[PDB]
Amino acid sequence: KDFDLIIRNAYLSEKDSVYDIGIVGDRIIKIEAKIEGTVKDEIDAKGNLVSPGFVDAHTHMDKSFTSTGERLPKFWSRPYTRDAAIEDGLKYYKNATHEEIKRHVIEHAHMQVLHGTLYTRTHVDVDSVAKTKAVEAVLEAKEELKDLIDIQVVAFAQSGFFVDLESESLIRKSLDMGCDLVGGVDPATRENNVEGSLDLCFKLAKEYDVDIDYHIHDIGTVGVYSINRLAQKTIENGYKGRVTTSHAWCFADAPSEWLDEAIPLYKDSGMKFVTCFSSTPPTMPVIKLLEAGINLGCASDNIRDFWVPFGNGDMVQGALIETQRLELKTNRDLGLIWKMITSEGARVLGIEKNYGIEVGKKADLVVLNSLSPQWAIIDQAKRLCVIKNGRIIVKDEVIVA
Ligand SMILES: [Zn+2]
Numbered sequence: 001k002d003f004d005l006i007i008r009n010a011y012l013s014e015k016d017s018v019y020d021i022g023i024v025g026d027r028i029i030k031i032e033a034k035i036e037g038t039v040k041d042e043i044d045a046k047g048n049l050v051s052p053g054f055v056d057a058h059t060h061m062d063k064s065f066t067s068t069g070e071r072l073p074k075f076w077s078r079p080y081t082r083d084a085a086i087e088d089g090l091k092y093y094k095n096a097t098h099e100e101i102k103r104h105v106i107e108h109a110h111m112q113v114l115h116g117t118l119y120t121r122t123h124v125d126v127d128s129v130a131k132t133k134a135v136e137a138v139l140e141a142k143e144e145l146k147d148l149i150d151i152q153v154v155a156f157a158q159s160g161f162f163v164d165l166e167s168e169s170l171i172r173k174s175l176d177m178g179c180d181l182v183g184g185v186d187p188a189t190r191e192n193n194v195e196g197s198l199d200l201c202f203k204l205a206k207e208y209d210v211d212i213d214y215h216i217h218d219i220g221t222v223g224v225y226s227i228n229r230l231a232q233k234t235i236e237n238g239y240k241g242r243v244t245t246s247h248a249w250c251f252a253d254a255p256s257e258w259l260d261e262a263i264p265l266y267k268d269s270g271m272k273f274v275t276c277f278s279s280t281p282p283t284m285p286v287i288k289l290l291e292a293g294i295n296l297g298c299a300s301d302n303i304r305d306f307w308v309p310f311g312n313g314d315m316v317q318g319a320l321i322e323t324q325r326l327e328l329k330t331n332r333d334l335g336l337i338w339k340m341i342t343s344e345g346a347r348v349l350g351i352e353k354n355y356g357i358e359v360g361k362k363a364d365l366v367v368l369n370s371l372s373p374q375w376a377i378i379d380q381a382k383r384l385c386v387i388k389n390g391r392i393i394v395k396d397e398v399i400v401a
Helices: 082-095 098-114 133-145 167-176 194-207 220-236 257-269 286-292 317-326 333-341 343-349 372-377
Strands: 004-011 018-026 029-033 038-044 051-052 054-059 119-124 150-156 180-184 211-216 242-245 272-276 297-298 365-368 383-388 391-395
Touching: 004 029, 004 051, 004 365, 029 194, 054 272, 054 297, 054 317, 054 391, 098 119, 098 133, 098 391, 119 133, 119 211, 119 343, 133 150, 133 286, 150 167, 150 343, 167 194, 194 211, 194 220, 211 220, 220 242, 220 257, 286 297, 286 333, 297 317, 297 333, 297 343, 317 333, 317 372, 333 343, 333 372
Parallel strands: 004 038, 054 119, 119 150, 150 180, 180 211, 211 242, 242 272, 272 297
Antiparallel strands: 004 018, 018 029, 051 365, 365 383, 383 391
């Protein structure tokens, strides 16, 4: 047989036309309006959109689904407060067993896969309370999930390198255990040492030759300042394109003049950003950043826990949420949001070379029940089929093998 798998009549948005997709093994090897040749299995997209696997560029798989179990979501029957949320996190990581954490990660992964997400980057809490317990469970689950989804693990110094002085050693162990990236939190309001926390993070990064993904929530000018120091140090340490800043809420409230003068520095350092649809500020300059050529991905962030009660791990649902938060309507704008949940996310993860519906690339695809990116966002229709490494793993809202 010429092909292991063929998807007939697949509308490809990047080419704006219907085609057949020829797959052998884990790669796409042919794309034509009508491909001749024998094949083992066939799927009829019936002219509907077929796209590459969605990318959820920022998750917390280890603590997900912790709000579930009761008539009402736990942790939310009281006004939201940063302290009560930080406490809930300490309790959880203290009493949670290795098997508890692993099952949550697996629940999360299955939910993502069912919605077409085949790539994701999760952050794992690393402090003197969670130790490497959470790290061990995540890496274990990651292995058990390699045939369903690709997971990047960030050793996340959640309490701050200068607040929990045990963080640095625990991060080395986590990186030694195999974590793919390292990251800290608010160098300013959390660490109270911008130069120190950033320099240390880069030190650890270089020791294990891993990339960086920083949580920067600080609003206004202090947030932009923190990001500018990070971008500048990125160039200094020869780390162009190896650094991601998550959230960057500060771009929504800092004077636009501050973002305008920093964009050249972000492009020169190849800084990557990720905005989570569970918190993207309405005034966040999303379209502006994309039009400027800045790499901006999208993500679920927390899912049903003490930080965010929401969550279905559905990037298509997230896209609709972004259009409402940002008040977007045109086909071009929805088209940009679709890029954000696909190719932009791929670039954030650094897998763009192998990402995309094109000859020679990975056979990781999603067959939707909608005519186009715009209609899929509007329709919110269920995925009809999900394919990873040339194998069908989801068929009609159910995980096959
Ligand atoms: Zn996060």
